[PDB]
Swiss-Prot record, chain A:
Location(s) in or outside the cell: Sarcoplasmic reticulum membrane
Domain B30.2/SPRY: 223-397
Protein's recorded name: Ryanodine receptor 2
Organism: Mus musculus
Quaternary structure, from the entry: Homotetramer. Can also form heterotetramers with RYR1 and RYR3. Interacts with CALM and S100A1; these interactions regulate channel activity. Identified in a complex composed of RYR2, FKBP1B, PKA catalytic subunit, PRKAR2A, AKAP6, and the protein phosphatases PP2A and PP1. Interacts directly with FKBP1B, PKA, PP1 and PP2A. Interacts with FKBP1A and FKBP1B; these interactions may stabilize the channel in its closed state and prevent Ca(2+) leaks. Interacts with SELENON. Identified in a complex, composed of FSD2, CMYA5 and RYR2.
Region (Disordered): 524-543
Region of the whole protein represented: 773 to 1386 of 4966
Length: 565, 75
């Protein structure tokens, strides 16, 4: 029996997926069709299932929701950002005026495609009959080219036209350079002797891809055949057949003569003396930096770009500080790097798979003569689709290159004398709200005080959009639920009057101009009034009240929504 | 009558003042998160039986969190 409610009129932007959330003490079973499960009831008409929603020729498993929420030891593959699956229309060819100098070739290759359309059917055993059938092994479109009408020759004609236009669009130039049947004699020449170059082979592949894209765009109007996927996502068994049909066109043409993520440890684990060594394994060879930072490092700035970190990047073999210097060599997929810091000598060293790194001046030392400050904490940074692994010690049985380097010079693991693991802080993604600090460039907020205002100011050369918000939110009781936005004239705005029990926080999203003196003023006419006084260039700044919302982007609409029934 | 006179203690004061708590907050990105030292340890059946996809969770796990009310956020 269905329920009497649903979340109508909600944002359809995104890739929806089924999810189940549980705390503890639960045994749940997803139910699909086929080998995955068995439905207990009958689905309503039209509604398919997930075992059919899976893409063809792809496996189906169950991750948790986002990340490595697995009860595992230090051997957790911590990952950085990712891409949008790189996939979440054919090539334009008809927009090219067909040159008549090779229209005779467009007809010759069309006749060749037609005679091969005869050839394959006759290889299977088809005669020339007056009935358009496929099981009666006959075809009425096998007669000589001239006798073919406009109702039978247009197919091959267009087949030749589209291939030539696809060639001109791709960029290469087109120019100047037996089984007895039932009446027809298809035999142009021996066109299957000269080896076809790999460029022309990839070209025939592209022609087949374009034809398949057109045919699939035609097919989407029908149900759900597994071939409705693009040619790149097509099974490789039938891939060669489509390429073979398009190879003959180029064969005739030739023959006829024509957002990184930062990870670190707890700030309290900082060190000020001794020799500390830790391992960083990387199964990939992408953008990955590793080093030692101070307990003031930024979770958004480049690791090492400031005076708060000293790192090393193998993707370019460069030590990272305020600037970059070529140091050491690059790594590959499935490597390790041991980082050592001596605070008694202020000496940083890195060993790639036990091999100590060398600089340009022939010194194994990486960094020297740095202030101890408040301490140095290990840190790593991963780029897009980069996974790694950190080892702060405590498992000498698992540490590989400790005996090779570190065991003899008085160097110790970072967490050798520990009874519990490290907290392993990271850089969070959701950008929550923070108070404007006084030592913040390009954004200054002042305070004045008649009426009380909170003026703004800025000095910068690059512009963006901000999301300024008040601290204390106004709460609404059970009865109260309405909000009216009155401009310089009267109240003309969207009907935002729905809040049984909520807390709205006043906010304004202002674009940063060269001069931005827009501010908020708590005023009074008859009730609670906040005036976000704007100035020149006021066409994209917004001002409203918002609950807890964590999204950083540049959009006036496309905001999340849902109306429950 | 006022904005400040709605989310504070007093309400019969129609003079629009601003206490020091009212300060502009911008959507910032300088924030660290703490990776917990213990997870739920959810075990999938991994058999994919023909009568459903099983997910199981038995061991309980709790944690305490402060609630900042004027920010309406749990930490």
């Amino acid at each position: 029996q269905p329920v009497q409610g649903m979340f109508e009129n909600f944002n359809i932007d995104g890739l929806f997926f089924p999810v189940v959330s549980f705390s503890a003490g639960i045994k749940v079973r997803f139910l699909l069709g086929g080998r995955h499960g068995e439905f207990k009831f009958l689905p309503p008409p039209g509604y398919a299932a997930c075992y059919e929603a899976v893409l063809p020729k792809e496996k189906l498993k169950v991750e948790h929701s986002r990340e490595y929420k697995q009860e595992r030891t230090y051997t957790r593959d911590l990952l950085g950002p990712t891409v949008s699956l790189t996939q979440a229309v054919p090539v334009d060819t008809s927009q090219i005026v067909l040159p008549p100098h090779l229209e005779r070739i467009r007809e010759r290759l069309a006749e060749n495609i037609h005679e091969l359309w005869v050839m394959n059917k006759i290889e299977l055993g088809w005669q020339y009959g007056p009935v358009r059938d496929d099981n009666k092994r006959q075809h009425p479109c096998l007669v000589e080219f001239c006798k073919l009408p406009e109702q039978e020759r247009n197919y091959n004609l267009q087949m030749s036209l589209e291939t030539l236009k696809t060639l001109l669009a791709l960029g290469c130039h087109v120019g100047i350079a037996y089984q007895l049947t039932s009446g027809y004699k298809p035999a142009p020449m021996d066109l299957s002797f000269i080896k076809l170059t790999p460029s022309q082979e990839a070209m025939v592949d592209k022609l087949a891809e374009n034809a398949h894209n057109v045919w699939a765009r035609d097919r989407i109007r029908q149900r759900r055949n597994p071939r409705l996927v693009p040619y790149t996502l097509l099974d490789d068994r039938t891939k060669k057949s489509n390429k073979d049909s398009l190879r003959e066109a180029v064969r005739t043409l030739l023959g006829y003569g024509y957002r990184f993520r930062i990870f670190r440890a707890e700030k309290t684990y900082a060190v000020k003396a001794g020799r500390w060594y830790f391992e960083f394994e990387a199964v990939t060879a992408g953008d990955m930096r590793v080093g030692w930072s101070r307990p003031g490092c930024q979770p958004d700035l480049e690791l090492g770009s400031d005076d708060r970190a000293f790192a090393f990047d193998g993707f370019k073999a460069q030590r990272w500080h305020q600037g970059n210097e070529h140091y050491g060599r690059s790594w590959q997929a499935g490597d390790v790097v041991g980082c050592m810091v001596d605070m008694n000598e202020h000496t940083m060293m890195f060993t790639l798979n036990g091999e100590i790194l060398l600089d340009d001046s022939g010194s194994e030392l990486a960094f020297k003569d740095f202030d101890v400050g408040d301490g140095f904490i290990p840190v790593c940074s991963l780029g897009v689709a980069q996974v790694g692994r950190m080892n702060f010690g405590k498992d000498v049985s698992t540490l590989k290159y400790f005996t090779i380097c570190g065991l003899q010079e008085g160097y110790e693991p970072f967490a050798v004398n520990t009874n519990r693991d490290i907290t392993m802080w990271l850089s969070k993604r959701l950008p929550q709200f923070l108070q404007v600090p006084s030592n913040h460039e390009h954004i200054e907020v002042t305070r004045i005080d008649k009426v009380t205002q909170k003026s703004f100011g800025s000095q910068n050369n690059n512009t963006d959009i901000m999301f300024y918000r008040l601290s204390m939110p106004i709460e609404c009781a059970x009865x109260x639920x309405x909000x009216x936005x009155x401009x310089x004239x009267x109240x003309x705005x969207x009907x935002x009057x729905x809040x049984x029990x909520x807390x709205x926080x006043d906010s304004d999203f202002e674009v940063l101009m060269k001069t931005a003196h827009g501010h908020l003023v708590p005023d009074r006419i008859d009730k609670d009034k906040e005036t976000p006084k704007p100035e020149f260039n006021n066409h994209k700044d917004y001002a409203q009240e918002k609950p807890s919302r964590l999204k950083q982007x540049x959009x006036x609409x496309x905001x999340x929504x849902x109306x429950x029934x | 009558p006022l904005s400040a006179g709605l989310f504070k203690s007093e309400h019969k004061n129609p003079v629009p003042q601003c206490p020091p708590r009212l300060h502009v907050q911008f959507l910032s990105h300088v924030l660290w998160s703490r990776m917990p030292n213990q997870f739920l340890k959810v075990d999938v059946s991994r058999i994919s039986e023909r009568q459903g996809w099983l997910v199981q969770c038995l061991d309980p796990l709790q944690f305490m969190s402060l609630h900042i009310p004027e920010e309406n956020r749990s930490v």
